[PDB]
Design an enzyme around this catalytic site. Sequence first.
Site, PDB file in Angstrom:
ATOM      1  N   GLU A  67      30.030  33.763  40.918  1.00  0.00           N
ATOM      2  CA  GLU A  67      31.034  34.172  41.528  1.00  0.00           C
ATOM      3  C   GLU A  67      31.980  33.277  42.970  1.00  0.00           C
ATOM      4  O   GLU A  67      31.203  32.516  43.275  1.00  0.00           O
ATOM      5  CB  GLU A  67      31.759  35.958  42.253  1.00  0.00           C
ATOM      6  N   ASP A  95      27.246  37.228  37.803  1.00  0.00           N
ATOM      7  CA  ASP A  95      28.331  36.960  39.284  1.00  0.00           C
ATOM      8  C   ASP A  95      26.428  35.832  40.693  1.00  0.00           C
ATOM      9  O   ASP A  95      27.103  35.097  41.103  1.00  0.00           O
ATOM     10  CB  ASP A  95      28.130  38.419  40.275  1.00  0.00           C
ATOM     11  N   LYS A 121      29.220  48.508  31.335  1.00  0.00           N
ATOM     12  CA  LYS A 121      28.353  46.862  32.282  1.00  0.00           C
ATOM     13  C   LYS A 121      27.411  46.701  31.143  1.00  0.00           C
ATOM     14  O   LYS A 121      27.089  45.425  29.791  1.00  0.00           O
ATOM     15  CB  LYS A 121      28.349  46.627  33.183  1.00  0.00           C
TER      16      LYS A 121
HETATM   17 MN   LIG Z   1      30.262  41.289  38.440  1.00  0.00          MN
HETATM   18 MN   LIG Z   2      32.003  38.372  38.304  1.00  0.00          MN
END
Ligand SMILES: [Mn+2]
Ligand SMILES: [Mn+2]
Length: 182
Positions: A67, A95, A121
Amino acid sequence: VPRGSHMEDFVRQCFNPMIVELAEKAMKEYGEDPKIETNKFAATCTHLEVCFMYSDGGSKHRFEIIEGRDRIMAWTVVNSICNTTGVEKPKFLPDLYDYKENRFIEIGVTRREVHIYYLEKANKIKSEKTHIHIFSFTGEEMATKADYTLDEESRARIKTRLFTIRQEMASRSLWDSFRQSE
Ligand SMILES: [Mn+2]
Ligand SMILES: [Mn+2]
């Protein structure tokens, strides 16, 4: 369109400038304006800082930060990690990658039940290999196989930071709209 909102001003005085810049770049990379979608501006900053505190936890060379990079460079690093170690290539960009545990990590920061956001998620990934770790603005956390990757002290710092941000928004009467926009 706007010259400067109250939420934007709080975001600029709350997060460190590198994070604010990365959030602006990541939103502009997706057609979003930080000056309008100010709640999403705070949440992108929050999500960024949490990812960076997370990567700071552990050893020196443990986490490959995904990320914060632009999309195509992020996928470049993912293809390299996949061809290096052999883990499965996820359908969605994670991430972090844990070199110690050999798994990609998805980090989530929610303003609802950690169970709800974990379920959201967990259903989108559907890659039995990407590890999932959710934080909330109330000090709660949930992680795959109850494996929380980092030590208690590192997670406790993140939780404290989230609650500090929550109080700060509320003092400025911004927390309600922030909690309702998710
Ligand atoms: Mn995330
Ligand atoms: Mn992300």
